[PDB]
Design an enzyme around this catalytic site. Structure first.
Site, PDB file in Angstrom:
ATOM      1  N   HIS A 181      -1.577  13.753   0.650  1.00 18.59           N
ATOM      2  CA  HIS A 181      -0.701  13.118   1.629  1.00 18.59           C
ATOM      3  C   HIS A 181      -1.232  11.732   1.905  1.00 18.59           C
ATOM      4  O   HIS A 181      -0.641  10.751   1.452  1.00 18.59           O
ATOM      5  CB  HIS A 181      -0.595  14.003   2.899  1.00 18.59           C
ATOM      6  CG  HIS A 181       0.160  13.365   4.073  1.00 18.59           C
ATOM      7  ND1 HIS A 181      -0.313  13.382   5.344  1.00 18.59           N
ATOM      8  CD2 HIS A 181       1.313  12.584   4.104  1.00 18.59           C
ATOM      9  CE1 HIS A 181       0.555  12.756   6.147  1.00 18.59           C
ATOM     10  NE2 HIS A 181       1.534  12.248   5.394  1.00 18.59           N
ATOM     11  N   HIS A 195      -3.700  15.367   9.060  1.00 18.36           N
ATOM     12  CA  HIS A 195      -2.431  15.825   9.615  1.00 18.36           C
ATOM     13  C   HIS A 195      -2.182  17.291   9.379  1.00 18.36           C
ATOM     14  O   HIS A 195      -1.052  17.734   9.242  1.00 18.36           O
ATOM     15  CB  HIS A 195      -1.321  14.941   9.093  1.00 18.36           C
ATOM     16  CG  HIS A 195      -1.715  13.478   9.034  1.00 18.36           C
ATOM     17  ND1 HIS A 195      -2.236  12.910   7.929  1.00 18.36           N
ATOM     18  CD2 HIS A 195      -1.565  12.444   9.971  1.00 18.36           C
ATOM     19  CE1 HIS A 195      -2.510  11.615   8.183  1.00 18.36           C
ATOM     20  NE2 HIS A 195      -2.077  11.329   9.421  1.00 18.36           N
TER      21      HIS A 195
HETATM   22  S1  FES Z   1      -3.847  13.214   4.885  1.00 18.24           S
HETATM   23 FE1  FES Z   1      -4.136  15.408   4.577  1.00 18.24          FE
HETATM   24  S2  FES Z   1      -2.482  15.934   6.005  1.00 18.24           S
HETATM   25 FE2  FES Z   1      -2.068  13.739   6.159  1.00 18.24          FE
END
Ligand code: FES
Ligand SMILES: Nc1nc2c(c(=O)[nH]1)N[C@H]1C(S)=C(S)[C@@H](COP(=O)(O)OP(=O)(O)OC[C@H]3O[C@@H](n4cnc5c(=O)[nH]c(N)nc54)[C@H](O)[C@@H]3O)O[C@H]1N2
Ligand code: F3S
Ligand code: F3S
Ligand code: FES
Ligand SMILES: [Mo+4]
Ligand SMILES: [Mo+4]
Ligand SMILES: [O]
Ligand SMILES: [O]
Lengths: 132, 843, 843, 132
Positions: D62, D81
């Site tokens: 992500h 997140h």
């Molecule tokens: S960077 Fe791993 S959940 Fe947003």
């Protein structure tokens, strides 16, 4: 990396073309026979002020026979297995054994009047990469 | 035009896994290989780093083996892992010699890929109608429902309440494994009378005529097309429909490339280049290509009036018999010499509906078929000179008194044409009289459609004539319907009426199922059966995509198709081959033979629970875990010479396989049969062929003359080169749909000018059977008043305007169709990009 | 696990074309840019050869702008040419600061691509039911049919015979251009009463309570979540449903990252790290994340009994009023001070169905809402200590006597919960009493669902309460139905019954159409109208995919969606933006506003031909050629401050746009409104806010108490993070469908043990409303007897088990649903690959 | 030229791994953090005699935060997140904001017991090509 790197090659000048008389060329190298063709009517992929200059591979994408051009019909015709391609409609196979429509050049008309080819929209016969 | 924009393809590496693959599709059965290798490994440009042993950094010359198009490449699952695949025609295969059609060459691209998003339409899970819509479920759940409803109906109303529609053919969606499985379920475990085939509405043969005469319809080999003096092609558009047979065997004959071979195999006999007679109302690209290769002087296009073939053949038979251009010793030695009397209702009708023609001796056939050149010219619309020329090209001896070798080939122009039984016999008469069966350069054969892969228990119980299943369904009879691998909505006759009633009857059961509790399954089944008792139909579809008829079904079961399973079939030469599995079935889909086995097992379980142990026992013999198990229980034990054939042995023989029947096995080779009837001993009790006394009696199917007389246009119908069948795979293929989003209807440009139609206009075709739509395609070669519409097509089904009319044996007479045409809409925007130019190659 | 196997992506070049793009989906409206460039050109790894000005041959660090995932890349048509596109979140946008949700980050991959075969399901042509099936056709044809049938019915039976279902929202499938077009058609040209919205079965507001009190539901800004002392989150699962608002604004508050900001903007006032009260029966990943960032001591999860919020708020109101923890000057200066008498049927019922609550002064509201901590503890199931703590966290002044700043946020737990009108008011009471409206760190607001983009003519004619459209349809009333951009089959209440009747009624018209000649259009329309007269329904669907309800419609018209058109909308902060077109609509699809225009034009033509020129004239004012024309006729001329807003001006403001309403324009900047009600003048005739006397009266929707009392489980329902809405795009997205092929139902593991259910088992959920299916997902955090099922899902629709029950204003009470659960099947094979582990992040 | 060219790199020997204790590793280069993990049960992409040795990128797809491993749960967890990935199910995102499941290594166990990585099934965070 990622994509094929097409060269920007000068093929001809707009003043060399006569209406409905294909001009022999090669793109993206010496070994990849094609033609430039001025059709007289605005058509898909066509360039120049009248939007009617197209460029195609001239080698059948089924088994690689050289295509002949019919001037009365404005079609490319294959003597191998009777395929027919329409350069007024993006090289659509009107009827034939190829699983591809005729590979068409991405053309650009320069500032002066030179015609450049900067890409090809389908795999040219006899090569597993359009640029070798 | 549609353009993939794929600049380069992964190179097949030296260590790719090789699989023998027969084309999924048409009768010709071209040889291919599927190469697979791990995703994220690849071949290179130097000879040592690729499968071809060739320097791929250089442009390849014409006809190179070292190339493949994008549609031959994909990424597919294999034993749980994504792998690259290339499915490439085989240069070494004697059928195609490296050719691949526009159809075969896109097997890869029409395979299922999650990675590259091809054919996401493919079924992955069983679906059942519940809670207001179609819902996915498990196999146990779906099979339990199908078994319980079927078992209840069969117990309450008899097996006659079970209606079946199934493939009987070879190749993808058929083959020996799958025809055996379904066959064993419905003919061994059960005795289902009310069963039809994928292309015709009863359990009959397409070619009873030739079979009754003692002449199996696939009697020659493909080499015979190379060796004949004259090819007679009847009701076939071979360049479009048997493409590579035509290109790789007929053309060499017409071009004179075969002469060397002709002289080696038949010395002391003269040989000129091949000539061809094409019997077809329409001028096709096949006619054009023959003229272009052989010269116009060597092509005789007989553009007969639709459905008048029998008149033509009878005239030819008479002329040839009178001139004496017949194999006298063949007639005396191999054909019935016994006189036999005409049945009392002859010539209008045969002895019964089971026998539309009268089998007899040569002499009686000649007298019975007798028709003059002049009468045949009236009926056919041909010139006398044309009919005489044909007789000369078929029968006239060569220079030294030597018999002319003619290969007679016919397909659906004849088989779905007028008076199937008699026309077939009339053609066979010509082959028999000229001694062109069982000899080099001869044959009277189907040029075929699908590949062949039939083995099943006895069908004696079905009767002859068999039940007209579509009429049963349309008439409100039958309770449960199992549909395997066919789509009547797009492809049956009288299709518009069929769809109206099928929807209405399956809706009854849908409304019942929506209003019942599913989680209480006994209540659900009782609700289904109540709807059936009131005239509804419970329908089960076994297929690979969401079909059209499937929109009316209550259970959908997902099948695996060739390539995702091992599969065996033979081509139009009896050439049998194994297609070796190279990928996994999508999702939870399974081969049809195994579906059948699993259904059988569920019937056994359910009936056992209900306490009908006697009936339960009938469903044993289905303990199959893999498709090979179905092959061994069926073909191996039941086909002529099956004892000689196994997967292992077929595999060793490659794409060339062997020609059935097998006669032995020596030193790693299945020994086969090049041609049938070489000894002059035919498939009858006494071993003599019969001629057929087959007089012309007009258009014989009910309604046909009436329909012709009261409508403006012939709505001829059939195939297009690019489209495979009902476009079941093609509808999710941009290359095909970009070319024909609507089905075309070929129309003469002056017919169009007269009707106020322009190229691309969307037109309604209509008559008293129904109505449909198509896209006007202007076609200068079309005769005035004669149109040709692409059949089977999801965006305009021409079956809608075909009548319910069949012959006595329930053969659908699709080709003789007439109707009116009127404009629905000005050419739509989505048709502006199409070329409307002639399909005929210009030199 | 699904894996794309994409090893590398084309690099965006330095000269890529940049487009401002707002996320298609949720209320937060995160900023993105779409970069496009010619197919067969590309960027390079050196800084000079890419859009980032960075060396891309080096691994990027965390949170880098110089990267994008495969789902952010595709190839799409732009002005007739294939181009690469990357849709990438904008680092500079103050909404998301570079974040993209699992939803927004796949806009590219869920766009239409012929080249890479994404979303082939997308509609390309108008479809009409004819010749036994759905068939493609031209726009002229399709619009003519719709216009003729609609005009005939409206002339013969009045406009009440026309039923409409339409989006009223912003973003993809809505926006100002599109709500205006449909609005103008049905409210200006026509006066359609029988119209419903996409998420509720009448033309009402979701939040009449707050509006009647004078408090518009979007009154604050997103900065206020950073500045509040306490956030009160009611009926919201923000981490999953307003993801980036939560991650980019709430978290910084809870983590203490906001303290610096708090102290700069509000000095001479104390500030600790934010605390959060979450009012939700279920423990969600939102609760888990708050505990994990803020600490358990700073999170107060009130796990109330389902539908008991109003009891909670009334108790909180009473306690806070009695302690005197209220903004006394705010109450005196900005709220109604006039006494006013309770209506005669109070407290069980309001003055009428139009007004379920009694608006009044603070003092009367307090006396009317009065509930002790002990009474509320009985009703809610909470501990007294918990309710008191919440009051302290909401009302207790800070150290120096300063008022506590609380942002009150609520979504569908409240809005689709018990007693919508009164619960909404009860919450607003708390905001008003504590002076937390129109001030920094305050607000009482919807956290919203879709983005907002509403502008339409007056809806006075519709009435209040408006017509319950679903009940009309289910009852056999209405003749013609226009469905724009919603799918009741998956998403309405009482859905099982709705589907049974809808199918039955539309089938009547289908059977009529199949049996009539289409090419004679007057006979076809008369046949449709005869079926309607007998109780049928003619249904027209305007959408981007083949929908579920679309399987019942007779005409389907293909829409273009955001990105394929310019589109304007505002987020939950009133932040308005232009999404600049970056690709072409697929096939012949067109924007909804233009579809409306074209339909209007056809209505004009057809009515003129019928001879009703007067009524024809009403359909003028639709000469629009592009979506901007709809923006200018609607928003620009009708919104507050619309004169200041144009495409050109919005474009210059980028993804940050401006906050509505516009109040001016200086030096290339639209001047906006950060917060509403900053002057203490509210949206009532006299400008004073009203409190609400809103006493608890149990479960108020008919049937609800009965359904609870006679079934075993709470069937709570709602969103999942990965799934957008009814999976209309997601069903053709392998990443989403690989994770949840069936909708999950979260169940306590001991509830499952008791019921004999295993992880993955396929279960029927059932009650007296209907039945449906879901996949048992074991969820340790779930309370005993309380299940949560994913809503809207094509492979198991939970709306089937929701009753027809609404409040007086026809607000659907989805969340209060109870039912029984029983096993349909052992866990299917297609579910073996799923993880069934906890969704909660573990440290 | 193309199709990404992965190197065949030794990461560890099977004897180095303890049940449920991830071994820090890097593939296809120094800068691409990952782990090898022996799970004790046969799982997708798993190798070795028990078919339970898997390898994953340890960097969240992500926004690129480093993932932590929970031993009790057998999950990778993201502190950025709140994403959760399951290495017993091909790295499936149990819940999270990534549009990708966890990138997994194509592993091979040699005759001597050495574990080789020869590919990765998804795009690693922070690079537009898995091989730089
Ligand atoms: S960077 Fe791993 S959940 Fe947003
Ligand atoms: N490209 C492609 N090839 C296929 C198939 C496909 O779907 N697509 N399907 C396969 C299958 S299942 C089949 S059955 C075969 C069909 O192969 P063919 O039978 O060759 O194909 P058709 O187009 O049905 O019909 C052939 C010709 O019959 C002619 N015809 C029509 N009416 C009459 C008549 O009264 N008398 C005569 N003499 N001729 C008439 C038509 O003009 C047409 O040219 O092709 C196979 N090959
Ligand atoms: S490639 Fe396939 S379609 Fe027929 S001509 Fe050959 S078998
Ligand atoms: S990315 Fe899109 S889905 Fe909502 S959280 Fe942001 S608007
Ligand atoms: S090579 Fe041109 S058609 Fe076969
Ligand atoms: Mo056929
Ligand atoms: Mo919503
Ligand atoms: O066939
Ligand atoms: O909503």
């Amino acid at each position: 990396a990622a994509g094929v790197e097409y060269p920007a090659n000068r093929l001809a000048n707009i003043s060399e073309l006569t209406l409905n008389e294909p001009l022999d060329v090669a793109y993206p190298d010496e070994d990849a026979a094609g033609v430039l063709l001025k059709l007289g009517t605005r058509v898909e992929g066509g360039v120049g002020p009248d939007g009617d200059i197209v460029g195609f591979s001239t080698i059948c994408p089924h088994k690689g026979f050289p295509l002949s051009y019919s001037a009365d019909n404005k079609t490319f015709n294959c003597p191998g297995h009777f395929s027919v391609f329409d350069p007024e409609k993006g090289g659509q196979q009107v009827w034939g054994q190829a699983t591809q429509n005729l590979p068409q050049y991405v053309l650009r008309v320069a500032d002066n009047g030179d015609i450049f080819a900067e890409g090809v929209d389908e795999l040219i016969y006899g090569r597993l990469s359009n640029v070798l | 035009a549609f353009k993939r924009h794929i600049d380069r393809l992964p190179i097949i590496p030296a260590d790719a896994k090789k699989h023998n693959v027969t084309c999924h599709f048409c009768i010709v059965g071209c040889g291919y290989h599927a190469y697979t290798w791990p995703i994220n490994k690849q071949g290179g440009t130097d000879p040592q780093n690729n499968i071809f042993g060739v320097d791929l950094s250089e442009q390849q010359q014409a006809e190179s083996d070292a190339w493949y198009s994008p549609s031959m490449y994909n990424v597919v699952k294999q034993d749980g892992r994504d792998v690259h695949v290339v499915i490439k025609p085989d240069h070494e295969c004697v059928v195609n010699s490296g050719l691949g059609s526009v159809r075969g060459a896109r097997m890869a691209e029409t395979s299922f890929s999650e990675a590259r998003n091809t054919q996401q339409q493919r079924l992955t899970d069983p679906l059942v109608w519940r809670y207001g819509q179609m819902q996915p479920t498990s196999w146990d759940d779906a099979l339990d429902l199908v078994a319980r409803v079927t078992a209840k109906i069969v117990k309450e109303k008899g097996e006659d309440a079970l209606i079946v529609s199934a493939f009987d053919h070879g190749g993808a969606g058929g083959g020996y494994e799958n025809t055996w499985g379904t066959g064993k379920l419905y003919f061994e475990a059960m005795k289902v009378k009310n069963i039809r085939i994928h292309n015709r509405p009863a359990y009959n043969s397409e070619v009873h005529g030739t079979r009754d005469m003692g002449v199996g319809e696939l009697n020659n080999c493909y080499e015979d097309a190379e060796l004949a003096d004259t090819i007679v092609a009847v009701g076939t558009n071979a360049l479009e429909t048997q493409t590579n047979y035509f290109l790789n065997h007929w053309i060499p004959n017409l071009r004179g490339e075969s002469l060397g071979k002709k002289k080696e195999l038949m010395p002391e006999e003269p040989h000129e280049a091949g000539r061809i007679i094409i019997v077809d109302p329409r001028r096709t690209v096949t006619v054009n290509a023959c003229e272009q290769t052989a010269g116009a002087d060597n092509v005789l296009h007989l553009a007969i009036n639709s459905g008048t073939d029998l008149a033509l053949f009878n005239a030819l038979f008479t002329y040839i018999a009178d001139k004496g251009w017949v194999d006298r010793d063949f007639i005396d030695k191999s054909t019935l010499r016994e006189g036999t009397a005409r049945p009392p209702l002859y010539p209008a009708r045969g002895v019964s509906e089971a026998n539309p023609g009268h089998l007899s001796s040569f002499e009686d056939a000649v007298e019975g078929c007798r028709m003059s050149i002049e009468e045949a010219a009236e009926i056919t619309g041909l010139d006398a000179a044309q009919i005489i020329k044909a007789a000369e090209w078929i029968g006239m001896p060569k220079e030294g008194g030597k018999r002319r070798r003619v290969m007679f080939g016919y397909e659906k122009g004849l088989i779905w044409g007028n008076d199937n039984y008699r026309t077939n016999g009339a053609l066979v008469n010509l082959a028999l009289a000229t001694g062109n069966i069982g000899r080099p350069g001869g044959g009277v054969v189907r040029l075929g459609g699908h590949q062949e892969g039939y083995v099943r228990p006895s069908d004696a119980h079905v009767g002859r004539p068999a039940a007209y299943v579509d009429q049963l369904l349309i008439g409100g009879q039958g309770g449960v319907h199992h549909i395997w691998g066919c789509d009547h909505y797009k492809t049956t006759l009288n299709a518009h009426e069929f769809k109206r009633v099928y929807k209405k009857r399956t809706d009854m059961v849908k409304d019942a199922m929506s209003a019942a509790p599913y989680g209480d399954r006994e209540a659900m089944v009782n609700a289904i059966v109540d709807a059936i008792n009131q005239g509804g139909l419970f329908a089960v579809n076994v297929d690979i995509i969401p079909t059209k008829i499937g929109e009316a079904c209550h259970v959908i079961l997902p099948a695996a198709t060739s390539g995702e399973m091992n599969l065996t079939s033979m081509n139009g030469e009896r050439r049998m081959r194994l297609t070796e599995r190279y990928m996994d079935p999508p999702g939870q889909s399974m081969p049809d033979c195994l579906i059948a086995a699993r259904l059988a097992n569920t019937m056994e379980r359910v009936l056992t629970e209900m306490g009908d142990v006697g009936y339960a026992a009938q469903f044993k013999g289905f303990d199959w875990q893999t498709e090979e198990d179905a092959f061994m229980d069926g073909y191996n034990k039941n086909a002529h010479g099956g004892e000689f054939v196994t997967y292992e042995r077929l595999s060793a023989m490659g794409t060339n396989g062997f020609q059935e029947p097998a006669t032995g096995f020596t030193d790693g080779k299945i020994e086969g049969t090049q041609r049938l009837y070489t000894d002059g001993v035919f498939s009858t009790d006494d071993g003599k062929a019969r001629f057929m006394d087959a007089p012309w009696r007009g258009l014989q199917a009910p309604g046909k003359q009436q329909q012709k007389d009261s409508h403006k246009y012939l709505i001829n119908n059939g195939r297009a080169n690019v489209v495979w069948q009902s476009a079941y795979l093609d509808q999710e293929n941009d290359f095909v749909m970009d070319r024909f989003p609507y089905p075309f209807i070929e129309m003469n440009p002056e017919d169009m000018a007269e009707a106020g139609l322009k190229e691309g206009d969307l037109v309604e075709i209509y008559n008293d059977a129904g109505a449909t739509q198509a896209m006007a395609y202007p076609t200068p070669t079309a005769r005035r008043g004669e149109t040709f519409m692409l059949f089977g097509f999801p965006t305009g089904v021409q079956g809608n305007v075909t009548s319910a009319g069949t012959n006595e044996l329930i053969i659908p007479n699709y080709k003789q169709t007439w109707g009116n045409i009127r404009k629905i809409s000005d050419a739509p925007r989505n048709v502006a990009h199409l070329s409307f130019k002639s399909k005929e190659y210009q030199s």
